[PDB]
Write a protein that binds this ligand. Structure first.
Ligand SMILES: Nc1ncnc2c1ncn2[C@@H]1O[C@@H]2COP(=O)(O)O[C@H]2[C@H]1O
Ligand SMILES: Nc1ncnc2c1ncn2[C@@H]1O[C@@H]2COP(=O)(O)O[C@H]2[C@H]1O
Ligand SMILES: Nc1ncnc2c1ncn2[C@@H]1O[C@@H]2COP(=O)(O)O[C@H]2[C@H]1O
Lengths: 200, 199
């Protein structure tokens, strides 16, 4: 792809092991990142430091974009490598140069920002309006329609744990496991420890 | 500034009265808006019509931007006029030509998307981390720090209805009543009718 190849030619790319923290909330934002390979979680915390997963991001996703457009912003969340990752980086200052050369690279970034706003808005509604079963059900549907979901003969395979679902919907891992058992009994899913199949 | 004035010169300007809906969730998105004057509320809804305010947007804000970057999308929320509004409107197709001539106009729009993502993400953490009591406590603390809060001898007085609290925190007006009474019992606020005093 020529636009993304040109862009990456102006970055420097680095390897990070699984569980590396790429971005820390509250740091000064001066750098944009782009996932060449691997997956990350975007995390926020409560007052006791307890984590919740705000999003997962994958190969082809920009990260660290939110301070690009205004001076002196701070990182809004933590970003942690869930797998080993290969991440391109570029300063905000150089990226702003690229945008004046070819605004298509800003369109590619902004498209992802717009998607994230859509997804995060929907999460506000799920948290505001739905009971725990309904939040879990939506979370499974959403994971199943991700590009990384694998098609099986009986449905979509997703890679997630009860603790991760809990950290998405705001309940305990035990509560998630009870609800997954209900959804299994209803013949809607098959739930293992690290994998769930959503039947279809 | 010259970028904004250049942009507006390519738009069709129109007026909405207070309480009108500018954008309905689920409609096909083909047009970008920009608020020249007035203010709007961005909301989402229950199946049962329960509402939650995602944001207020004001003069200078783009609206209807989320469908710009891929064809075939639907509007993600309702946008309703909180006051009479004058709004500039441009097709996505035309606006994409503008971006190529001067991408500063996209920087302006993407700057607002970034702020909205930060604000909405904070709302997700509040909803997920806090029970309805904690959400109300925190909403009252926040309102007490706003300019419309009235400093009194006993603390900061706010004027807000149970209804209005519910469409911030995600609970019904009756639930709001119960929590406020509990908080009062704990000698943290006084709460009666639409008048709250935060000690
Ligand atoms: N709601 C969200 N959805 C997806 N990614 C997010 C969200 N909130 C923050 N991030 C990412 O987490 C990064 C933290 O650093 P920045 O705020 O610079 O840029 C942020 C985004 O890349
Ligand atoms: N979380 C949010 N914060 C502020 N504005 C929003 C949010 N979600 C949706 N919008 C606005 O509401 C509009 C509804 O139509 P669009 O999805 O085209 O574009 C959307 C944005 O302009
Ligand atoms: N989960 C919820 N339960 C009830 N009302 C809600 C919820 N989330 C948002 N709301 C809105 O908050 C409002 C509070 O006042 P009402 O109960 O009259 O109407 C309510 C709804 O419009």
């Amino acid at each position: 792809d020529p636009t993304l190849e040109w862009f990456l030619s102006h970055c420097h790319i680095h390897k990070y092991p699984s569980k590396s923290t790429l971005i820390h909330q509250g740091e000064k934002a001066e750098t944009l990142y782009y996932i060449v390979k691997g997956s990350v979680a975007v995390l926020i915390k409560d007052e006791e430091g307890k984590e919740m997963i705000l999003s997962y991001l994958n190969q082809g996703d920009f990260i660290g974009e939110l301070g690009l457009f205004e001076e002196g912003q701070e990182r809004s969340a933590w970003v942690r490598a869930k797998t080993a990752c290969e991440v391109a980086e570029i300063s905000y200052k150089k990226f702003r140069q690229l945008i004046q050369v070819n605004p298509d690279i800003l369109m590619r970034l902004s498209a992802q920002m717009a998607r994230r706003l859509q997804v995060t808005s929907e999460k506000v509604g799920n948290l505001a309006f739905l009971d725990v079963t309904g939040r879990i059900a939506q979370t499974l549907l959403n994971l199943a329609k991700q590009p990384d979901a694998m098609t099986l003969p009986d449905g979509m395979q997703i890679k997630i744990t009860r603790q991760e679902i809990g950290q998405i919907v705001g309940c305990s891992r035990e509560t998630v496991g009870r609800i997954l058992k209900m959804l299994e009994d209803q013949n809607l899913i098959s739930a293992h420890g690290k994998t769930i199949v959503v039947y279809g």
